[PDB]
């Protein structure tokens, strides 16, 4: 019974947003952790076959110099929000001559998280993870298709979300350091992945006031995995 694409539920909320939330569950996982020194971040590329080249897949694109990102679910929906969020950061810098804070980026995206309709089609099917360091310190953020944007100290998403959060509050405290958290993510990743953890499956991303930038290169990760 294909009814109004913009119609409320008997509970009730937006039917199509509630259907959009279930589209995050079949996407690949990711792990964010807020550190007092910076923000580390993790994802899994989910290599489908040895046909494919592994390093062309992007799950982390870096929005500004100082604001990282992590996408999920349908990637081709995410690319549009990436490219326009960059334009909103640059417009902030060229009206203002200062760095756009990490908070106002996600207002500037989540104000159009809901634009579907017929006049004035479908909501987006992505669950983003924004990191970065503004003057308020290293912030770690999270937005949904509903636009309900909230700060999260150590957020998981995707298929692994339940076990990764559930296992992740046990191993987190207030005074985490960076290299503790970096090897504290890959334990969870090698628990939650189906392929063997190696140099081609995952990618880390860190952003700090004093370790920058410090982006994401290979052969760092070789030293990172072999510390297990």
């Amino acid at each position: 019974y294909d009814r109004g694409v913009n119609t409320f539920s008997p509970e009730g909320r937006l039917f199509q947003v509630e259907y959009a939330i279930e589209a995050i569950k079949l996407g690949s996982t990711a792990i964010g952790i807020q550190t007092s020194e910076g923000v580390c971040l993790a994802v899994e590329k989910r290599i489908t076959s040895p046909l494919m080249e592994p390093s062309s897949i992007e799950k982390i694109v870096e929005i500004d110099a100082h604001i990282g990102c992590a996408m999920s679910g349908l990637i081709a929906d995410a690319k549009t929000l990436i490219d326009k969020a960059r334009v909103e950061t640059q417009n902030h810098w060229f009206t203002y001559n200062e760095t756009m804070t990490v908070e106002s980026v996600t207002q500037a995206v989540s104000n159009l998280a809901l634009q579907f309709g017929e006049e004035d089609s479908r909501p987006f099917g992505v669950a983003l993870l924004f990191g970065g360091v503004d003057e308020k310190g290293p912030q770690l953020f999270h937005m949904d298709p509903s636009g309900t944007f909230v700060q999260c100290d150590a957020r998981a998403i995707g298929s692994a979300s339940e076990g990764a959060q559930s296992s992740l509050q046990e191993v987190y405290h207030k005074s985490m350091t960076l290299k503790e958290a970096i090897k504290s993510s890959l334990i969870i990743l090698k628990q939650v992945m189906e392929e063997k953890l190696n140099a081609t499956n995952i990618e880390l991303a860190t952003v700090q006031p004093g370790q920058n930038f410090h982006m994401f290169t290979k052969e760092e990760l070789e030293e990172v995995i072999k510390d297990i």
Binding site: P10, E11, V17, Y19, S146
Partner: protein
Amino acid sequence: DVNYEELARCTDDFNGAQCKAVCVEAGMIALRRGATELTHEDYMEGILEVQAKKKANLQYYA
């Protein structure tokens, strides 16, 4: 210990037969609670229970 005013105003379109089920569900939980005594907040608990609908919650709706 019942005001009877709070449970009254919170009822909108709720059937009278469902009001009997309110004291049922509030009496069914009294088993696992271990005490047959009930409180005024247990009424509105079983009142909002049966209606509106059940059991889900609002997410993804912003």
